[PDB]
Ligand SMILES: *[C@@H]1O[C@H](CO)[C@@H](O)[C@H](O)[C@H]1NC(C)=O
């Protein structure tokens with residue numbers, strides 16, 4: 150093998166470099182190269198990518214989401230909920246130093262951290278009907294605070310919930326206000342969640358606090374053969390029919406011993 | 410009752426539930442859901458139900 | 462039936478090289494010898510060489526020895542012909558032709574459609 | 582629907598086992614067909630050698 154990543158039948162792969170799948174899909178500030186992504190043939194990820202979830206926490210069913218990305222060749226990102234749809238909540242103060250952008254604190258771009266506005270947090274009751282003709286990947290989250298002082302300082306409500314409801318999804322959440330150790334400089338956590346919204350189906354969000362509200366979702370506009378490749382090999386500006394993580398194969402042999 | 414629960418307890422099952430009162434899409438004309446649960450009750454073993 | 466399908470026509474500069482393939486369609490040709498025959502405009506047919514891939518023979522003409530490279534792929538059933546150091550005398554119509562047996566003595570009963578190479 | 586990796590694992594495991602056993606059956610049939618025809622040829626040659 151010549152030890153380079155090539156195009157699979159003339160389609161450029163999605164090479165995330167130091168970004169991860171979670172940082173890409175949630176919109177990491179250190180992944181702004183991949184805000185608008187064309188159609189790919191396969192996804193290339195590093196073995197230990199530096200730009201993971203910048204705020205500490207987790208993406209729930211992350212490996213199920215990565216299994217669904219082996220059957221998706223193109224996303225077309227749309228703004229399902231604009232930031233002007235939150236008049237009574239602060240959409241600009243939700244930043245942290247764990248997600249820095251050019252030295253200044255920032256946040257994920259595909260979701261909005263909603264802080265209390267005018268020392269109040271009214272109960273969010275918002276819905277989005279999928280009027281498109283294809284499936285929609287919607288990512289939201291919950292912020293687990295550190296103490297009750299942080300809970301009153303950020304959301305004004307001591308006991309909050311998050312209700313998410315679709316045709317097949319019934320979700321009720323509550324923040325786990327506890328003491329953790331410092332990961333990435335922050336003591337709080339953020340559990341992120343995803344679903345696939347079918348056409349002619351609505352998603353309903355209800356919360357009175359701790360809501361990492363979605364702004365950008367992803368339209369699944371193409372399905373087909375794909376994979377997520379764990380490879381540190383650089384791009385080679387080349388085309389091929391067979392690709393391995395260590396390098397593409399351009400031969401007609403019945404066997405190879407390059408990579409499983 | 411606004412805040413209800415369901416407690417189910419056997420020799421091997423310890424279950425506590427609460428309804429997820431939320432807005433969700435219409436399936437079969439209804440916006441309510443019903444999560445159904447099952448267990449296998451061994452002989453000479455009781456199942457206890459508690460709910461309000 | 463077996464039909465030999467060649468590549469398209471090539472336009473080349475002098476000093477470059479041209480690679481012409483001959484895919485055997487409708488059946489394999491690994492047990493027969495596939496020859497490469499060129500035809501200059503206004504001249505007769507000229508043998509360049511051939512390959513018998515399972516038999517393991519790769520023959521070349523003495524007037525083309527060292528300048529033409531003929532290889533075969535037995536997994537894609539494709540025979541290739543690479544001609545280096547093109548001049549204006551290499552302008553011809555290039556045919557792949559399958560023999561009647563494993564070697565080159567038999568008559569070439571299956572022919573490709575031809576590939577015109579013009580050097581200018 | 583939230584168990585797609587284990588479902589793909591089960592599908593690939595059962596398909597791979599069916600492929601291994603299909604290969605085993607086909608290759609055993611081909612190899613023993615060669616051995617049977619060569620066995621018949623050896624029996625004819627061996628009867629000829631016995632008479633000779
Ligand atoms: C792809 O095939 C071409 C054929 O010319 C070869 O030059 C190239 O090295 C191959 N690429 C890889 C990555 O093996």
Ligand SMILES: *[C@@H]1O[C@H](CO)[C@@H](O)[C@H](O)[C@H]1NC(C)=O
Pocket residue numbers: 278279349350351433434435
């Ligand atoms: C979404 O829109 C469709 C068509 O506009 C409508 O029939 C359906 O009831 C809506 N879904 C909801 C409100 O959950």
